[PDB]
Homo-oligomer: 130 residues x 6
């Protein structure tokens, strides 16, 4: 059962030279790249539609400022249970073995975003890959 | 308390060039290779005695076809709590940090098999290493 | 984004890299050498057109390989980027290099990097007008 | 919220050539080295003040003998939630993805020690870095 | 199993590799170069006999090392496998190679690879009759 | 601790290595070549003094870099350690080496290793009297 999920490689991954290292972990898990776009500086409006459900929260503007402070890469990966499986690779900073667990230490500069559900994926994918 | 467990490196590991990568993780955990046999194409009868407890299940024939579609390696590792420890390294595809968690994405082509118990180990070891 | 430099070069990550899951491995070596990405473009199957202009010099046989699977064109920036990355690409006989460590075929060699300032300019023009 | 924790790289890491591999995992998690001391052979009295809460336990002398059988490195790392985060990287031998999980197989020769609490950290840091 | 080629060579993964836990590291470099395994044999302690025939040319001192710990003999297949793998083995002074990156001793050098077509044939015969 | 040898050399892990989080990566390559650590010293900011004596030969510009961020001085021991580690350090153009794979600047080059027996002795004296 193939699925497609959207993944974002945040500006901090570029600053810390962890782009290849992050994509590699996903690649080694056997997921394929269907679509890919490189953003030297993603358009703010595009960032705000993506994080719109956090529109009423405190760090919304900062997270937005951050997502626009460096290049970004948006990828559409394809694979079996891709959405759930990749969301797990991403993990969290308190779980070693995952991407955020082994490489991140901030809840804002967390190197990567992966769709968390089917709806979220279809919406997220339509945003960066209309 | 030393133990010996049986490990199988499945055909997909060869197709995907992950043989060294899998053995390395076990090696780095400090387990030693006691016995090793390389099978360009393991004999089907040997495969069926090994998966005989699944003899009445749907994917039995397919899993069997798969295990005979490429080379295989059978290894007997030795170490403290080897059986339980290695079974954990193997893990599952939903748990990053483990072998199946970081490299597999199918419940059939799961790159590796590790004995799941003492009895299973003694029986499995007598099968590939009579 | 420190990486930045005094030279711009074109890199092509070939289909075989995708089939053998070495895309990251390859990009990692360049990234660790501290070169930055200026432009990047992914093609599920680069246009027959561009492949022809690029190698415009068994021509059709290789062209077929470069069009089979997907490719990624990248523009790297850094000091002496052209030469340095070329050395990273290396060849099938030189261990320590990308082709040296990961490839064993003169056509299916995983990656392409501009060999000269002239090449780089034309190559960047073909993939990034 | 920065914190400082104390970390010890045990003699076995040296024997097994895993010093860089262990420090690398901590480094990649983005923690910085504040202080560092290399001990060809740490002084026994220093080892006993550190493991003094185990003074009445069976393996106390052995663990002590071991900690003095090879070189050791004491490091003070600094980062956000450093104490808790690094304690997690260290993990245990039953949890792959962590340092002990991927590289250790003995509860004594466990390659690394990381402070387990703030008090433990302040005390441990005053011990090796008075 | 694409790897396949036009040449067959013999590799010996020495005891020190096992003691230093570099067996996988070593096999990985060859596997990433895309060479396939044809034959493989593990010896908890290769026969004194075979060690003698192999190096049949301080002879006894080295023979002792090759018989101390375990060894793994492997037959690799690929285009120009003999030469290519030999270059991967390299030497103690050449970084980027197996011996170059991982060894620092002329006897205890982790791995052996056939140096020529003739050698390869005889070596494969000794370990894989 | 087998590593041990017949030669002693001095290594400096520069500030850029810390900023780019390559300290372990660098130390790992030497450790895998099986060299052992004899002496080691971490400096949050090595003394202006020592930097001057070391390079005592734009002098002030480089001295500033070596004093900006932290550094780690290490004394490695092994057979032919001086030469061998020097080769591991290599240069910006040689892939497979530390500078070859990870650096792209003649000043900010991540690591320093004694180039000769004489150098090694003086360098070890400056950082480890």
């Amino acid at each position: 059962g193939l699925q497609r999920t959207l993944v974002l490689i945040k500006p901090d991954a570029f600053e810390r030279s962890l782009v290849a290292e992050i994509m590699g972990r996903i690649e080694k898990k056997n997921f394929k790249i269907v679509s890919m776009k490189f953003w030297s500086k993603a358009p703010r409006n595009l960032i705000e539609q993506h994080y719109k459900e956090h529109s009423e929260q405190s760090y919304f503007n900062d997270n937005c400022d951050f997502m626009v402070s460096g290049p970004i890469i948006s990828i559409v990966y394809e694979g079996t249970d891709a959405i759930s499986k990749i969301r797990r690779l991403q993990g969290n900073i308190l779980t070693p073995g995952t991407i955020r667990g082994d490489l991140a230490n901030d809840i804002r500069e967390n190197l990567i975003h992966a769709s968390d559900s089917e709806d979220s994926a279809v919406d997220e994918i339509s945003i960066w890959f209309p």
